[PDB]
Design a protein around this ligand. Structure first.
Ligand SMILES: *[C@@H]1O[C@H](CO)[C@@H](O[C@@H]2O[C@H](CO)[C@@H](O[C@@H]3O[C@H](CO)[C@@H](O)[C@H](O[C@H]4O[C@H](CO)[C@@H](O)[C@H](O)[C@@H]4O[C@H]4O[C@H](CO)[C@@H](O)[C@H](O)[C@@H]4O[C@H]4O[C@H](CO)[C@@H](O)[C@H](O)[C@@H]4O)[C@@H]3O)[C@H](O)[C@H]2NC(C)=O)[C@H](O)[C@H]1NC(C)=O
Ligand SMILES: *Cc1cc2c(nc3c(=O)[nH]c(=O)nc-3n2C[C@H](O)[C@H](O)[C@H](O)COP(=O)(O)OP(=O)(O)OC[C@H]2O[C@@H](n3cnc4c(N)ncnc43)[C@H](O)[C@@H]2O)c(*)c1C
Ligand SMILES: COc1ccc(C[C@H]2c3cc(O)c(OC)cc3CCN2C)cc1O
Ligand SMILES: *[C@@H]1O[C@H](CO)[C@@H](O)[C@H](O)[C@H]1NC(C)=O
Ligand SMILES: [Cl-]
Length: 500
């Protein structure tokens, strides 16, 4: 439960010089490094579990040796890249643990010849994107709308982004990877085998080992794409109409179009931010939406043309493109709780109406609506661990957030969210209610790896969220887990169990 001369001497010997031991002092490097990448303030209070030590390996070898060193002791290993885990699963642990922060492993190498990039797993989506923009104005990538999200976790869980309707998930565009196993062995795709290389591409972070790097195929983008970020202030009726048509418009659009929705309310006043992206020019985009979705009341000045980088930065809400390269630019200072859904049937407008009413009851709540279809429909459900492909229509996530001034009311917020999730149950996927691993959710349960009764039955107990996240791919994920980590060194409350 301590740090100690053994671990410290082991690190020092292997020349892993960047590490600090636990200290409550606000002005200590330990505390500062700890809270640097805690992206959900819900897990920042003094009662939360703290790492005995934080290690910041500066290279692949330092990472391997770090893992080797921690292995010599009793600590649970925690890997943190961007720290965007909704449940703080990268910096918390029931058992005493060591925090391996990967923020120094944030280097990108772009190959304009192969049109691929080697990305150290501590790189955020923003840093990667920015690198790409620096190297090329014809190239881009897709992984999710949040620039401060680490590639290490996001790609490990998939990565559903602004252009996933054309290119699929981030994990779907990974051609190689350097993963460090429980024994510090450095393995490329060649070394790790196709089952493990399959598993790490969406199978969840903190399960298979430490991804040192991702070799991703860079994605073509026109010199100019078109976007619009337009907040509509309306009543619940018009909002209901708009969302109800939105599901169909968005799902049935070509792959060169992405219409996502942020939404919220406050009694009478319902706000809906429309985020539109067109793989192409303003004229084509505005024409397409003027025909297909004229009820949006989108005008000429709403559609802006810009580079891909500028567009992602714009829809993320960043002031400039350069802000992408800033990993500590907080997206939102508020502690949050978010649950997600995936639909296979179209939503009745009463689902949207109920959602909007509930949102009107709680101004701190909001929703995010993304369409699937397009390229997502074409990729086989077993190409990568992410199963929700053909037949999947919408990703509907419900978020509730609050500042510290509101922290006393925490539970209420949670309660509200719970109700929302219960209200949406009949209209969404069933048997099982589908989930998404990057949208990790402990309400679905959790494994206590200290309880050997549970551990003996780990697989079936984990099936509850396992089928939710992966469906039919769960079995192959288990085989892969058994292959790459039979001693379950990489575990968390919802990690894939090894075979018995
Ligand atoms: C464990 O890991 C942690 C996390 O990585 C480590 O903490 C990090 O430590 C970094 C230093 O090694 C530190 O980087 C610094 O970040 C600050 C921002 O807080 C930034 O200002 C610093 O940038 C200066 O230095 C770098 C080179 O080291 C230069 O590339 C850069 O241009 C800056 O130098 C210039 O600006 C300074 C003022 O900001 C001037 O004082 C300086 O003279 C210089 O000015 C010249 O260059 C300018 C630009 O060309 C020019 O305009 C001007 O006219 C002059 O010509 C630096 O990057 C990280 O902040 C820190 N990270 C965190 C999160 O804390 C830690 O070190 C590791 N621990 C161990 C044990 O190794
Ligand atoms: C905070 C946040 C998350 C978002 C946002 N938007 C998303 C989007 O538009 N599309 C998405 O598909 N997902 C979005 N998400 C969720 C993120 O995708 C997930 O939260 C990612 O898992 C976050 O990754 P990361 O930033 O690295 O957070 P961590 O807590 O460090 O990692 C999570 C998980 O993965 C393990 N892990 C971290 N690092 C590694 C390495 N390199 N190797 C193996 N495993 C790793 C951790 O242990 C942890 O279990 C928008 C916002 C605002
Ligand atoms: C169009 O694409 C999207 C855009 C924005 C989001 C919201 C984002 C978020 C935004 C916040 O402000 C926030 O407050 C703490 C928490 C969260 C967690 C959920 N999350 C993923 C989701 C999307 O899918
Ligand atoms: C292990 O889990 C089972 C099922 O929840 C429970 O009955 C038992 O008390 C637990 N044992 C320990 C050691 O906590
Ligand atoms: Cl993206």
């Amino acid at each position: 439960a301590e740090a100690g001369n053994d671990l410290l001497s082991c690190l020092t010997f292997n020349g892993v010089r960047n590490h600090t031991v636990f200290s409550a002092d606000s002005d200590s490097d330990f505390n500062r490094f700890l809270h640097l990448s805690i992206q959900n303030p819900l897990f920042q209070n003094s009662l939360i579990s703290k790492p005995s030590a934080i290690i910041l390996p500066g290279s692949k070898e330092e990472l391997s040796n770090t893992i080797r060193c921690i292995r010599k002791g009793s600590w649970t290993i925690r890997l943190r890249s961007g720290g965007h885990s909704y449940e703080g699963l990268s910096y918390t642990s029931d058992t005493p643990f060591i925090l391996i922060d990967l923020m120094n492993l944030n280097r990108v190498s772009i190959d304009l010849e192969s049109e691929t990039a080697w990305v150290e797993s501590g790189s955020t989506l923003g840093e990667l994107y920015y690198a790409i923009t620096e190297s090329s104005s014809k190239l881009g990538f897709t992984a999710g709308w949040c620039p401060t999200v680490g590639t290490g976790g996001a790609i490990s869980g998939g990565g559903f982004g602004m252009m996933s309707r054309k290119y699929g998930l981030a994990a779907d565009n990974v051609v190689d990877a350097i993963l460090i196993d429980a024994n510090g062995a450095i393995l490329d795709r060649q070394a790790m085998g196709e089952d493990v290389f399959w598993a790490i591409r969406g199978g969840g972070g903190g399960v298979w080992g430490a991804i040192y790097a991702w070799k991703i195929k860079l994605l073509p983008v026109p010199e100019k794409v078109t976007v619009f970020r337009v907040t509509k202030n309306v009543a619940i009726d018009e909002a209901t109409s708009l969302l109800h048509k939105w599901q169909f418009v968005a799902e049935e659009l070509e792959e060169d179009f992405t219409l996502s929705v942020l939404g919220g309310a406050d009694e009478k006043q319902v706000w809906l931010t429309m985020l539109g992206f067109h793989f192409g020019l303003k004229t084509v985009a505005k024409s397409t939406f003027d025909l297909l979705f004229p009820e949006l009341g989108l005008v000429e000045e709403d559609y802006l043309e810009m580079s891909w980088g500028e567009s992602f930065a714009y829809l993320a809400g960043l002031e400039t493109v350069s802000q992408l390269n800033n990993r500590f630019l907080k997206f939102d200072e508020r502690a949050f709780k978010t649950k997600v859904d995936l639909t296979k049937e179209p939503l009745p407008s009463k689902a949207f109406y109920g959602l909007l009413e509930r949102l009107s009851k709680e101004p701190n709540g909001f929703i995010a609506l993304n369409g699937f279809g397009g390229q997502m429909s074409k990729i086989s459900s077993d190409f990568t661990p992410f199963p929700h492909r053909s037949g999947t229509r919408l990703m509907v996530e419900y978020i509730v957030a609050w500042n510290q001034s509101e922290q006393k009311k925490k539970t209420e917020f949670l309660d509200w969210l719970e109700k929302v999730y219960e209200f949406m149950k009949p209209f969404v996927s069933k048997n099982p209610r589908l989930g998404y691993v990057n949208h990790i959710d402990l309400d679905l349960g959790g494994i206590d790896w200290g309880n050997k009764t549970v551990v003996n039955n780990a697989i079936e107990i984990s099936r509850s969220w396992g089928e939710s996240y992966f469906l039919s791919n769960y079995e192959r994920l288990i085989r892969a887990k058994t292959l790459i980590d039979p001693n379950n060194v990489f575990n968390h409350p919802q990690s894939i169990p090894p075979m018995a």
